Structure 1
Amino acid sequence: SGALDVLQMKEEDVLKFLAAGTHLGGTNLDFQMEQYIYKRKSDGIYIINLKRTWEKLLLAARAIVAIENPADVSVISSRNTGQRAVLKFAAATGATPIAGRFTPGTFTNQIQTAFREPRLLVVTDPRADHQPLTEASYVNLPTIALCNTDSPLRYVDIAIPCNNKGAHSVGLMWWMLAREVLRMRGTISREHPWEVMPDLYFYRDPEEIEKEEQAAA
């Protein structure tokens, strides 16, 4: 990942980042998230440096590969924004999903029915998933999490800087993670592009849903 042009970012991907508005952070700024910021605009939005976003991504590749048995990855999102994403990722990687309503005390209460004991976690948003974090103290769990400038860095061990607010940049970051996990092991060649489209990972609004069913009919 370091000092290696092979795994480095591409001109298409750079255009993808900017199109989502990944560089485009939030309005408020935590004093811990300074390292990731480039500069301020007029209109007051901080621009995230996408190469270092890239670097954190390659660190994700290293970590996911290091987890040898892929079943024991867990991938959570309560809100709908990352709901299709965690599913598509579990589909490709062979992981165990948690789709909405993370039942509290799942990791601690043994007798409770859904007692899963994974070795790694991937959250989409800390505030909405505070309950996993409080369990993630009681159990020895490492954690990846998509975090904005506002996001607080309690108990998070590897935050990934993106525009986790936007729909596109979010689904996109999940697509790139699934790619890199596959490319870093002996599966895919870098010559071809991956067939799957990032809009496959996307979230569709019910109005767009009625628009599709209406266009079908």
Structure 2
Amino acid sequence: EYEYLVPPDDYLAAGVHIGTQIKTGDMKKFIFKVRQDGLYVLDIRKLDERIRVAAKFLSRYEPSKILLVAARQYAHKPVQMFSKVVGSDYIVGRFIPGTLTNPMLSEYREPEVVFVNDPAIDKQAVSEATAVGIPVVALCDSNNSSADVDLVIPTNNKGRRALAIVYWLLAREIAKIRGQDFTYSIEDFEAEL
């Protein structure tokens, strides 16, 4: 029996397994099945394994050197709350071109690892981080595919609740490794509306 970070039903209730109508070759290994309504379903066993791995991966960096990126609206709150807990830097909303490549921009930063919400939406950040040799972690849905993403977290990266539980779990596990008290609830990470 596999031991999940949370009861399996919690993952399903959050809709992390709900993909899109599109499947990429890169994501096939994470797709459990395709629903009759054409929607692809992600493997929660794989998601759980990847969240654990990502938490360990990220705990190998000093907090301030971690940069989270997310233009997608429902990801802003989860990203900011994750940062509140982990101590990572973040950029939500429009990512300004040159933020990682132009030392003269006021927004310029030099993180050692970049974590984006969606490689398609946050493509500018992914491309720049890769051009500068910075490892890229990313949430990838069935429709995503990027040769520039180094560490993948296969999950619904669009749903309000799905994003809340994933960022919440990542922050929770990183805090555990760090021996930092964490009492936040999934609701605390969830975007309004």
Per the shorter chain, which TM-score range? over 0.9
Q: Following TM superposition, by how much is the alpha carbon of 1:147 offset from its aligned partner in structure 2, in angstroms?
A: 0.8
C-alpha distance after superposition, 1:116-168 (max 9, x if no partner): 10100110011211111221232111011111010112301111111112110
Q: Residue 56 of structure 2: which of 40, 46, 62 is its match?
A: 62
Q: State which drifts further: 165-174 or 195-204.
A: 195-204
Asked if 1:51 is matched to 2:39, the reply is: no
- Structure 1 unmatched ranges of 5 or more: 189-193, 206-217
Equivalent runs, 1:32-181 vs 2, <5 Å: 32-67=26-61, 69-181=62-174
Give the fraction of aligned pairs with identical amino acids, expressed as a percent.
31
Whether 2:184 is the aligned partner of 1:204: answer no
Separation in 2, partners of 1:107, 1:165: 25
CA distance in 2, matches of 1:151, 1:157: 13
Taking the aligned partners of 1:138 and 1:31, their CA distance within structure 2 comes to 24
CA distance in 1, matches of 2:191, 2:160: 7
How far 1:21 sits from its partner (Å)? 1.7
Q: Is the 8 A contact 2:130 2:136 kept in 1?
A: no
Contact 2:63 2:86 (8 Å CA) reproduced: yes
Separation in 1, partners of 2:78, 2:28: 28
Q: 1:186 aligns with which of 176, 179, 190?
A: 179
Q: Which residue of 2 aligns with 1:209?
A: none
- What are the Cα deviations for residues 22-75 of structure 1, in whole angstroms up to 9, with x where unaligned? 2221111112211111122322222222111111111112111111x2110001
The answer (yes or no) to whether the contact 2:140–2:157 under 8 Å persists in 1 is yes
User: What's the counterpart of residue 23 of structure 1?
Assistant: 17
- SS of the residue corresponding to residue 55 of structure 1 reads helix
RMSD: 1.8
- Of structures 1 and 2, the one with the larger relative CO (CA 8 A, separation 6+) is 2
Which structure: larger Rg? Answer: 1
What one-letter code is carried by the residue in structure 2 that aligns with 1:23?
Answer: H
Distance between the aligned counterparts of 1:127 and 1:181, measured in 2? 26
3-state secondary structure, aligned to 1:159: strand
Structure 1 CA distance for aligned equivalents of residues 180 and 185 of structure 2: 18
Whole-angstrom CA distance in 2 between matches of 1:131 and 1:40: 31
TM-score normalized with structure 1 length: 0.83
Structure 2's unaligned 5+ residue stretches are none
What code does the residue aligned with 2:123 have?
H
Q: Partner of 2:79: helix, strand, or coil?
A: helix
Q: Structure 1 residues 79, 49: CA separation in 2 closer, same or farther (over 3 Å shift)?
A: closer
What is the DSSP-based 3-state SS (H/G/I as helix, E as strand, rest coil) of the residue aligned with 2:138?
strand
